[PDB]
Each structure stands twice: as C-alpha cells, then as structure tokens.
Design a protein around this ligand. Structure first.
Ligand SMILES: [O-][O-]
Ligand SMILES: [Cu+2]
Ligand SMILES: [Cu+2]
Ligand SMILES: [Cu+2]
Ligand SMILES: [Cu+2]
Lengths: 279, 78
C-alpha cells in the first residue's frame, strides 16, 4: 500500500496533508539537511573522478533512495502522505494544477523571480531558504523562462526505447538510457525540467523547491517504465569499475544499500498506474 | 589543459577566473571576491552550482550565467 500518485490526481485533502507534512519537516529543521546533502553530491560528483548521485549509472538508484528517505520523513509526520509525481510531459503549462495556490504556488514575479502565492511563498513566513548559494532567502521560480518547453511524451518515449541502461564511460558523455533520461546528451529530459522551473530548481540546492521531489518521483517512475519495456536489460556496470558504483557496491552516503537493493521499487511502493510489460 | 584566466566587470560585478564538500577542482571562479563552485563536463562545457543543469562553453560563460542568476545579490561562499 504505499502508492505514489500523479500530482494532477490528488484530492484536496491529499494536497493539504502533503503540504502540511513538508512545512513541518521544514519547521523542525529536518528538511534543510536534504538540501545540503544534495548540494554536496552535486558539487562532488565529477565526470573524471568519483561520481555517485549524478552523471553516473547510480543517478537513478541514488535518487530512488534519497526520495525514500524523504518520503519516510514525511510519513513520520503524517503516515498517510506519499510522494506524488509530476508528469511534466502531460502537465506542461504554467496553468497546471500543480502550480495553483493550494499546492505548490506559481511562477515568480518578473523582477526578482520571487514566488508570490501558495504555501511556500516567502511572505507566509513558513519557507525560509537557508541552505543556499545565491544569498537571497525567498523561493524563486521562472517557469518557462530559461527554456521554452518541457519534454513531450514523444521525446520521453524515444528515451524509454533505448535498451542499454548505461554505457562506458558511465558519465555525462555516455550514450544509453540513464544519460538520456538525466539529460546531458540528447533531447534532454531531467536536466531540462530543472532549467524550465528556474529559481533554486536550476541550482545544486534544487531541493529547496518542493517540486524537486515531484520531478524526481516522475524520473523514478520513468526508470520503472524503462524496466517494464526492457525486462531483459539491467543495471550496469556489474563489477570492478573505478569511481562508479557497480551493481552490488554500496552507495554513499548510506553505505548500507546497493543499486541491486533498489532496482525493484515494489519492495517499497507502487504507482497509481504503471503499464505492464508488452508489445 | 586549463582554460586561460580572465578578469572583467560584467553587469556591475567583478568576475575572475583562474586555473587552480565539493570536487577537488582545477579552475576557480570568483564573483566580487567570493568563490563560486564551477565544474567542467567531459565534453569540455562548464556549469556552476547556481546553474548546474545548463552547460555553457567556458568558465567565463559560467561566471556570467551566475551573475545573471544572482540579479545583484551577493554570493555566499561554499
Ligand atoms: O539532479 O537533481
Ligand atoms: Cu540530485
Ligand atoms: Cu534533479
Ligand atoms: Cu517481452
Ligand atoms: Cu569542487
């Protein structure tokens, strides 16, 4: 029974309870350490050295475990809450209900990118931006400002059709599914969404925006969809690769979990809908 | 081989670059004397921590993208 639901489908009660649980993690001091951990891996993961959270095959299991840690923290506040996901190929405009004042609030105003509505607007006093590099302390967004369009379903399908999970050199130059989903090569899925939201979502402290979790919950769903399309293909590499997390190697910062432990999401949650394998 | 150094005033901010919790790095950028984390990608493009997901061709381009992002605000050190 943990079911991760498309954001577009949440009831008003589910939106209220998700927002309240996120705001309580922020109030209690727990939220900001997720932002810090993410920025430390963003700044440390490099194409020519050790790389774990990003630009590497473990991008997908790493974010799956990071999102599980966050969802478990939300459930410690309200056990009914699960992470929703944002299908940005379907819900692709600023008028999507995701961006309404009863959910995440909308785009930032034109002068300073400040978000002016919703529960995370700085004027509420409930969403200080603490872990930061740009010194301003208010949530900012510029939806569609730095890149015109979110990816489309056709572009997503072109990436889901790639049969190799990843390929040497296992970094931002790779061909293969992982790097096309991450977006450093090709039509660009995940990186482009960060750029399209703008504000803190365009930076290494991107978890400052609660939409981070919904974006990564949909990236995580696309990994599950890829597995259903390619039940014969699996995580690589499978042993002895310097600087890259192999299938059965443990992953920082937890050190107690491996990609192998995270491949099957159903050990932890299911989705509202996930196509079964077919032709 | 490292990019060349640079020094200019861009949009009223002093930006400097030079060959040299985060990756032990080969090039340094500063915005009004505050160091900005930057990184080079395998294809030779660059990013910074305030524009991480949007590669640009050079460290000066990353520094200029950071000044654009900041909209006049001070950078905090990393
Ligand atoms: O990648 O966030
Ligand atoms: Cu990340
Ligand atoms: Cu991301
Ligand atoms: Cu089949
Ligand atoms: Cu570094």
């Amino acid at each position: 029974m943990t079911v991760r639901k498309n954001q577009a489908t949440l009831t008003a009660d589910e939106k209220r309870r998700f927002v309240a649980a996120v705001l309580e993690l922020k109030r209690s001091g727990r939220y900001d350490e997720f932002v810090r951990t993410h920025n430390e891996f963003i700044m440390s993961d490099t194409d020519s050295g050790e790389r774990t959270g990003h630009r590497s095959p473990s991008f997908l299991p790493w974010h799956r475990r990071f999102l599980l840690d966050f969802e478990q923290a939300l459930q410690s506040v309200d056990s009914s809450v699960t992470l929703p996901y944002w299908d940005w190929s379907a819900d692709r405009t600023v008028r999507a209900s995701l961006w309404a004042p009863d959910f995440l609030g909308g785009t930032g105003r034109s002068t300073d990118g400040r978000v002016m509505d919703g529960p995370f607007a700085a004027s509420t006093g409930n969403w200080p931006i603490n872990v930061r590099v740009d010194s301003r302390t208010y949530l900012r967004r510029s939806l569609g400002g730095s890149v015109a369009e979110l990816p489309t379903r056709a572009e997503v399908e072109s990436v889901l059709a790639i049969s190799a999970y990843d390929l040497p050199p296992y970094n931002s130059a790779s061909e293969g599914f992982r790097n096309h989903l991450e977006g450093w090569r090709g039509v660009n899925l995940h990186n482009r969404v960060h750029v399209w939201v703008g504000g803190q979502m365009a930076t290494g402290v991107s978890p400052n925006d609660p939409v981070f979790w919904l974006h990564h919950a949909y990236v995580d769903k696309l990994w599950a969809e890829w597995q259903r399309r390619h039940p014969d293909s699996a995580y690589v590499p499978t042993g002895g690769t310097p600087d890259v997390v192999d299938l059965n190697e443990t992953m920082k910062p937890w050190n107690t979990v491996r990609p192998a432990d995270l491949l099957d999401h159903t050990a932890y949650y299911t989705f509202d809908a996930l196509e079964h394998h077919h032709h | 081989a490292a990019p060349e150094s640079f020094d200019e005033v861009y949009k009223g901010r002093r930006i400097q670059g030079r060959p040299a919790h985060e990756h032990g790095g080969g090039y340094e950028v500063f915005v009004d004397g505050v160091q900005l984390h930057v990184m080079r990608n395998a294809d030779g493009s660059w990013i910074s921590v305030v524009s991480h997901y949007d590669p640009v061709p050079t460290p000066r381009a990353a520094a200029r993208a950071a000044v654009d992002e900041l909209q006049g605000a001070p950078l905090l050190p990393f």
